[PDB]
């Protein structure tokens, strides 16, 4: 009821390929769109760490929500 709806929507966005989870090469593909376009300049290896604060190496549904939260 207004909440989890738009929540699961954002999850699908990143998880366009599927798998039901976001990997390092996944979120990365989304970072380009979020920022714009970058031929080189590699530094995403740092962003993945910020999200992968679970040590699992991936982002699930629950972790996704926590990531959005401060
Ligand atoms: Ca995926
Ligand atoms: Ca994680």
Cα separations (Å) of 13 from 16, 30, 42, 52, 55?
Answer: 5, 9, 22, 18, 23
Ligand nearest to the CA of 61: 2
Q: Which residues pair with 22 in a beta bridge?
A: 59
- The number of distinct structural domains making up the chain is 1
| Technique behind the model | NMR
Give the Å distance between the CA of 29 and the centre of ligand 2: 18
CATH number where 51 lies: 1.10.238.10
Closest-CA residue to 47 (of 67, 21, 20, 17)? 67
As annotated, the binding site includes 15, 17, 19, 21, 26, 52-54, 56-58, 60, 63
Kindly report the three-state secondary structure assignment for every residue of the chain. Answer: CCCHHHHHHHHHHHCCCCCCCECHHHHHHHHHHHHCCCCCCCCHHHHHHHHCCCCCCCECHHHHHHHHCC
Closest-CA residue to 21 (of 32, 11, 29)? 11
- Residue-number span of the structural domain to which 31 is assigned: 1-70
Q: Cβ distance 29 to 37 under 8 Å?
A: no
Give the Å distance between the CA of 28 and the centre of ligand 2: 15
Q: Cβ distance 20 to 59 under 8 Å?
A: no
Give the Å distance between the CA of 29 and the centre of ligand 1: 10
């Amino acid at each position: 009821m207004i909440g989890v709806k738009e929540l699961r929507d954002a999850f699908r966005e990143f998880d366009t390929n599927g798998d039901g989870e976001i990997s390092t090469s996944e979120l990365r593909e989304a970072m380009r769109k979020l920022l714009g376009h970058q031929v080189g300049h590699r530094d995403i290896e740092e962003i993945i760490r910020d999200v992968d604060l679970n040590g699992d190496g991936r982002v699930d549904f629950e972790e996704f929500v926590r990531m959005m939260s401060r």
